[PDB]
DNA sequence: CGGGTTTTTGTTAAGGGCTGTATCACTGTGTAAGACAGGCCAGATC
């Protein structure tokens, strides 16, 4: 429940919003930098680490069976069970969008020295139109992984597109798409509570089961307290999913998620409405099959916050969430606050 | 197609005055960051 001030290193311009953090046994690795990758980086990823709440950069080399990907704006980060990463949708430098799915992971490690291999994948079957601003999570039923992906935004399709309207989006259908991860294989499951296109959610998953929370939705320009319980089951033959819609919900976009601990996430950030910036936290609880969201403590802002516009960040893993705002520029460009909660 | 006759059109010289054009020496627009080689200390080491 504490905000701390963050010193920046020099290389402050390759952060911006929309990146990706992920971690790897307690290293945080940074994602997603603005532009094509200069000659400081041939690769992008970077060591995210805090010391003496400073802030400090590192590059990092890839292996040599990898594949060098482009950087992405607003990806499709999941979790895995050796320990792996899911990575899907963004957009490029070139504002285009890519359909790719990719896999990273370690390949080694030598003195606080890590090594990648990043995998393409290939998608076959029922493959999604390249989405961005979604989620993607993994459910684990009877010994079995298999991946839920819903949402996302994208453009016009290749016919109604006008170079009049060539930036226009739109949100994508609500259908749910499972993915094999092992098959490289997908499958187009449509369902009959979901009838409008949400995007910008957050997506808490469990053994078998993923929960949607808040979003928002171009069709109507509404902010819905939603929420769904999708129990995806992976029987003997073919799997089976549904939905079911439950009270209690928050009307909020572009979410931050956290875990302090098991069966209990955190929320913070986000948008109540157009200007009304979002600045009460929420506290969930995973139980067996039902779910309770409550109010915590109100971390106290400083006065840069309470008077700002727009804010951006993801998650660390230790509990702890680092969060920007847009500073000066003639300057420093943003600022940078950690937040503390355990 | 000619004289007799007529009305238009130049033609010289020198000077005056208004109009147009060449000539002079110059300018303002080509203006922020990144790649790279070399030196150097902190530190794991056999």
């Not at 290193?9 to 997603?32: K, R, T, W, Y």
């Not at 307290?225 to 033959?237: E, K």
């Not at 976009?253 to 936290?281: H, P, W």
Request: aromatic share 10%.
């Amino acid at each position: 429940m504490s905000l701390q001030m963050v010193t920046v290193g020099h290389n402050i311009a390759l952060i911006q919003p929309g990146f990706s953090l992920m971690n790897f046994d307690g290293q945080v690795f940074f994602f997603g930098q603005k532009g094509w990758p200069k000659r400081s980086c041939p690769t992008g990823v970077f060591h995210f680490d805090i010391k003496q709440n400073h802030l400090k950069l590192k590059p990092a080399i890839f292996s040599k069976d990898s594949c060098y990907l482009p950087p992405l704006r607003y990806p499709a980060t999941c979790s895995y069970k050796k320990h792996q990463y899911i990575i899907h949708g963004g957009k490029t430098p070139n504002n285009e969008l890519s359909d790719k799915i990719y896999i990273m992971s370690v390949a080694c490690k030598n003195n606080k020295k890590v090594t990648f291999r990043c995998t393409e994948k290939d998608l076959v079957g029922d493959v999604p139109e390249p989405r961005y601003g979604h989620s993607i999570d993994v459910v684990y039923s009877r010994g079995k992984s298999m991946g839920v992906l819903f949402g996302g935004r994208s453009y016009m399709p290749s016919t109604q597109r006008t170079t009049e309207k060539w930036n226009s989006v739109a949100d994508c259908l609500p259908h749910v798409f499972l993915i094999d991860f092992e098959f490289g294989c997908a499958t187009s499951y449509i369902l009959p509570e979901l009838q409008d296109g949400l995007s910008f959610h957050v997506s808490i998953a469990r053994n078998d089961t993923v929960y949607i929370l808040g979003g928002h939705s171009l069709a109507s320009n509404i902010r819905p307290a939603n929420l769904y319980r999708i129990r995806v089951d992976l029987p003997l033959g073919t799997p089976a999913v549904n939905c079911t819609v439950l009270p209690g919900g928050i009307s909020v976009s572009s979410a931050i998620l956290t875990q302090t601990n098991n069966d209990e996430f955190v929320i913070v950030g986000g948008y109540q409405l157009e200007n009304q910036k979002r600045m009460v936290c929420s506290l969930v609880s995973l139980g067996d099959n039902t779910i309770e969201i409550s109010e915590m403590e109100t971390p106290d802002w400083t006065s840069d916050i309470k008077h700002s516009k727009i804010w951006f960040g993801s998650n660390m893993g230790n509990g702890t969430i680092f969060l920007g705002i847009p500073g000066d520029n003639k300057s420093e460009a943003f600022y940078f606050y950690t937040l503390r909660c355990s």
